[PDB]
């Protein structure tokens, strides 16, 4: 009981593999923008102060949230790489640290372009 430390938090492993295991196919189809830009919307939807209460409210439940997620993506017009990983985020109660998983996507995307020469 004397001093206190506060380390930052970003990129870890199972959360980073969620974006790299879904965008790994996007890297071959050139969807890093289709998956990195749509995933950011999930972080803003939970970061929003009016929407943050709806995602953390105890009434959304889990089975009901699965239908609300698919019924929201239908109006959000997500991309071909954002209507599957979205369920995993709301499948096992993963809407608390969901923005940290999107940040790892930007760091993993840098490793998909560094080893891919495509300029003339």
């Amino acid at each position: 009981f004397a001093k206190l430390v506060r380390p930052p938090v970003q990129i870890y492993g199972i959360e980073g593999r969620y974006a790299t295991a879904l965008y790994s196919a996007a890297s071959k189809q050139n969807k890093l923008e289709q998956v990195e830009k749509e995933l950011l919307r999930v972080g803003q939807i939970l970061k929003e102060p009016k929407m943050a209460a709806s995602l953390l409210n105890p009434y959304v439940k889990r089975s009901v949230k699965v239908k609300s997620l698919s019924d929201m993506t239908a109006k959000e017009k997500f991309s071909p790489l954002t209507s599957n990983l979205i369920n995993l985020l709301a499948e096992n109660g993963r809407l608390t640290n969901t923005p940290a998983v999107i940040s790892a996507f930007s760091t993993m995307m840098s490793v998909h372009r560094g080893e891919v020469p495509c300029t003339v």
Partner: peptide, 25 residues
């Protein structure tokens, strides 16, 4: 507690494409 995951997003990619194997069991 609420835990128990095994790279589910990785196995899901194989179901949609599954085009990368190198003798691994």
């Amino acid at each position: 507690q609420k835990t128990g995951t095994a790279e589910v997003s990785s196995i899901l990619e194989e179901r949609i494409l599954g085009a990368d194997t190198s003798v691994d069991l």
